[PDB]
Chain A
Amino acid sequence: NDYCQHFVDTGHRPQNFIRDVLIRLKDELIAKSNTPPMYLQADIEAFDIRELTPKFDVILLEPPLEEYYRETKCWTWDDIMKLEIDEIAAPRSFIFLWCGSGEGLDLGRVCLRKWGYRRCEDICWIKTNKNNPGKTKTLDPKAVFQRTKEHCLMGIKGVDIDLIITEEPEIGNIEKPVEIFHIIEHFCLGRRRLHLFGRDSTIRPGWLTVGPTLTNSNYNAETYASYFSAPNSYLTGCTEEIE
């Protein structure tokens, strides 16, 4: 069968027809090793990002792009490129950048190189339309095709697949699939994990979440640092706690 012709015939996206779309010990180890959830309301444009210490092993960056508000403060790639992300990243560290599906696939790569990373993976969030086969798409003027996926770029400085398949969320829902956290945490990259532009709804053990729409804060730099003082400085986040 030709699923592309089918999508032309019926409006069902080809991804609708993908099927099936001891790692529990790793998960349980992740949970034991996880720091308490920490979170801070901060307007990131006006916030000295250097006030977030210590240097992070993982950074998940989820800037609110205009393209997320089809039928609905947006950050442009101009603004995102000016973030001083290399000032808070550990010399060996990882970034995960949600780039959307348009110009972000290019400007996101400029960002990664500007902040000193090289891209090692391209994780695509592929959206099914099983529940609204009819609903079409207001196409970007430059678009050639209907856009039905988003990319999260993984960068490095110094078990899982690169695909996430879920149903397209309701219009105006900007949440990214929580599966990205599982992918990230299964890499065992260290325990200082920062989520920039997270929300009340994404707060999660093992993560420091910083963003303008958080309603509460509990961040304390010295309290936060204390979770990684010796003997715990170099833990991967996938090993037992030190007695």
Chain B
Amino acid sequence: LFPPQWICCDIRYLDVSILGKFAVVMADPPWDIPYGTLTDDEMRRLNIPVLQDDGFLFLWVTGRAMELGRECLNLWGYERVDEIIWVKTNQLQRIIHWLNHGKEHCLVGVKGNPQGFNQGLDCDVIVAEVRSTSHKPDEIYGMIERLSPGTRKIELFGRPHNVQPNWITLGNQLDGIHLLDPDVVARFKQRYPDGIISK
């Protein structure tokens, strides 16, 4: 079901096996050290492996999570095959520890044998204005749609500004549960007959 869908939940406790398989996964995790974080062990323990058989993972990282994100990506069964950077500019296309930071990194991982994707349509550099702090640039969605048009996608640790057609968005600041895909709706009621997602 094409229009946006979402589940407010503690991603730690949701049984994601109800969601089906996805052509693309994207996560922008709250890595450990305002909002709720996950420890490194919790990050590692996420059930990312059930979300795909063949497809791509997009994993935003920063600081020391550049290394820890590579660990989770490998632990969850992916090989890192690309690394996207977003060059942060102002509205006049000028660039906003040891150096000042002008970019953010998004690791790109592959699982299995993805077929029918339009690899090589975009390049690995995004140039876009910092619209709102902590927000990823909307350009990533277009890149992912050109790469895998029409397919099912899931975002972990998203926020209401993140919901998109063809995407299911998970995060704890979303507005209740809004599911439209009949296969998903069926499995959710079965798994959660009283609509409560508990530990």
Give chain A's interface residues, CB within 8 Å of chain B: 2-5, 7-8, 13-15, 17-21, 101, 105-106, 109, 119-124, 126, 137, 139, 142-149, 151, 154, 160-163, 183, 187
Tally chain B residues at the interface, Cβ within 8 Å. 43
Q: A15-B87, A144-B108 are in contact. Are A139 and B120 (CB under 8 A)?
A: yes
Is B87 a contact partner of A18 (Cβ separation < 8 A)?
Answer: yes
30 A-B Cβ contacts within 8 A? A2-B142, A3-B126, A4-B122, A8-B121, A14-B125, A14-B126, A14-B127, A15-B125, A18-B94, A18-B127, A20-B95, A21-B95, A101-B83, A106-B70, A109-B67, A121-B97, A121-B99, A123-B99, A126-B85, A137-B120, A139-B119, A142-B79, A142-B110, A143-B81, A145-B121, A146-B124, A149-B85, A154-B98, A161-B101, A163-B102
Find A4's partner among B56, B120, B143 (CB 8 Å cutoff): B143
The minimal Cβ–Cβ distance linking A152 to chain B, given in whole angstroms, is: 11
Flag whether B93 is at the interface (Cβ < 8 A): yes
Give chain B's interface residues, CB within 8 Å of chain A: 56, 66-67, 70, 79-85, 87, 89, 92-95, 97-103, 105, 108, 110, 117, 119-128, 139, 142-143, 146-147
Q: How far is the CA of A14 from the CA of B98 in the complex (A)?
A: 27
Is A162 a contact partner of B146 (Cβ separation < 8 A)?
Answer: no
The minimal Cβ–Cβ distance linking A240 to chain B, given in whole angstroms, is: 24
Is B119 a contact partner of A144 (Cβ separation < 8 A)?
Answer: yes
Q: How far is the CA of A122 from the CA of B82 in the complex (A)?
A: 15
Residues of A within 8 A of B89 (CB): 18
The residue of chain B having its C-beta at the shortest distance from the C-beta of A8 within the complex is B121
The minimal Cβ–Cβ distance linking B68 to chain A, given in whole angstroms, is: 12
Q: How far is the CA of A122 from the CA of B104 in the complex (A)?
A: 10
Residues of A within 8 A of B94 (CB): 18-20
The 3 closest A-B CB pairs, nearest first, are: A14-B127, A146-B123, A142-B81
Q: A142-B110, A183-B99 are in contact. Are A19 and B93 (CB under 8 A)?
A: yes
Is B125 a contact partner of A163 (Cβ separation < 8 A)?
Answer: no
Q: Which of B79, B82, B128 has the most CB of A within 10 A?
A: B82
Q: How far is the CA of A109 from the CA of B105 in the complex (A)?
A: 15
Q: How far is the CA of A121 from the CA of B98 in the complex (A)?
A: 7
